[PDB]
From a paper:
The structure of ASFV E165R was solved by molecular replacement, using the structure of P. falciparum dUTPase as a search model, to a resolution of 2.30 Å, with Rwork and Rfree values of 22.2% and 25.5%, respectively. The structure is a closely packed 3-fold symmetric homotrimer, with one E165R trimer in the asymmetric unit. There are 447 visible residues (residues 1 to 149 of the total 165 residues in each subunit) in this structure, which account for 90.3% of the intact protein, and 16 residues at the C terminus of each subunit are missing due to the poor electron density. The E165R protomer in the trimer is mainly composed of β-strands. The 14 β-strands (β1 to β14) form four sheets: β1, β2, β6, β7, and β14 form a parallel/antiparallel mixed sheet, β3, β8, β10, and β13 form an antiparallel sheet, β4 and β12 form another antiparallel sheet, and β5, β9 and β11 form the third antiparallel sheet. One α-helix (α1) and two 310 helices (η1 and η2) appear after β1, β13, and β14, respectively. By comparing the substrate/product binding pockets of apo-E165R and the E165R complex, we found that the binding pocket of apo-E165R is much larger than that of the E165R complex. As calculated by CASTp, the solvent accessible area and volume of the binding pockets in apo-E165R are 249.3 Å2 and 163.2 Å3, respectively. Only their C termini show obvious conformational differences, suggesting high flexibility of the C terminus of E165R.
Residue numbers in the entry:
A (entry chain A), B (entry chain A), C (entry chain A): 2 to 149
Write the structure that this text describes.
């Protein structure tokens, strides 16, 4: 099976990520993740913190996953693109998820909290089976760094 | 096996999509789709209609597919990019395919009909086996909406 | 298994690609490739030659692979993006690898040799097992063109 594990880092993110074990019944390939804070995107590159730690497992083994823009991220009011096309995250990374978002416009752009700009897709485009939202400071073995 | 199903919506698109069952002998991963109309791309975001309905099947089950730019889309004469890197389409969608194309230049850009700017790639990068072009108003069960 | 094969074309690229058979022990999905020459990226589209020939094999059969930007390519000092989101290369191509890189800034950008801007990922996001660096003018059967 293919399972995702998301743990909020800040207490602000915990309001959007309450603990549960969602079964992905409707076969949605992507896992939407929230902007847990209001943010102003200046023209050019922006580093957007997602306030979450993510691990994805395939066949009982930790695997990589992809960060992809949602159709909602780019509109006529805000020309936003992911800087690196799609973000690849290796299974060894156990830190906070960060986005590189380019504001192609010439004026600052405001994004509001609860807005989902990106989605997480597992390596090989495997549809997830469960999406576990772990509580804030649960010590999870998949989030322990393992220098190779 | 992996099979694609394309049905033109307009009669203008039918000239470019005549009915047949192509066997993908040459293992081409992508399925080119035409701009069935001349269009002017203003600077910034553009919504480009593709005048087709698409379904993709893997192992007898409906799956998702990806919209990806072709190497031909961006040239020195026209700075065009897909707005969301690559477009993900869930298997439940049975509507017309739409592109979000960003014109990064400062002057309008003209695209002519028959030009193929994007290609369709199945979930998991599975090379297709057949590419079925269904006639305009054939009622196909894979194009019937099924609210989940 | 999944194996990559890289052969430098120029003698300048050979300094960065010395011959060996690396076993991908640390399960890195991507294969970093170097800019083997200093280059100036003008605003707009740039054609960047990588001075390498690449073949990727999956289950003893030649397959396609994807060119993806690294997190290092886009920074606050240089707004660079791959023009076509991610580059798809069909298994039939046996020529030199070329990048379409868009400089979104208004002033030229300098990239230095040994800098890795992109990475190669196999079709289906299969983690490689070996990364073979073939010497400059070894005649390899996977690099012989086979018109289909």
């Amino acid at each position: 099976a293919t399972n995702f594990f998301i743990q909020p880092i800040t207490e602000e993110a915990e309001a959007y990520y309450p603990p549960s074990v969602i079964t992905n019944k409707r076969k949605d390939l992507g896992v939407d993740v929230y902007c847990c804070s209001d943010l102003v995107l200046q023209p050019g590159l922006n580093i957007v913190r997602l306030h979450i730690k993510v691990a994805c497992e395939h066949m009982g083994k930790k695997c990589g996953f992809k960060i992809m823009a949602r159709s909602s991220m780019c509109t006529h009011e805000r020309l936003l693109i992911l800087a690196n096309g799609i973000g690849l995250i290796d299974p060894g990374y156990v830190g906070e998820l960060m986005l590189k978002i380019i504001n192609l416009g010439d004026t600052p752009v405001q994004i509001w909290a609860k807005e989902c700009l990106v989605q997480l897709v597992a390596q090989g485009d495997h549809v997830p089976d469960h999406i576990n939202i772990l509580k804030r400071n649960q010590i999870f073995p998949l989030f322990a760094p393992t220098p190779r």
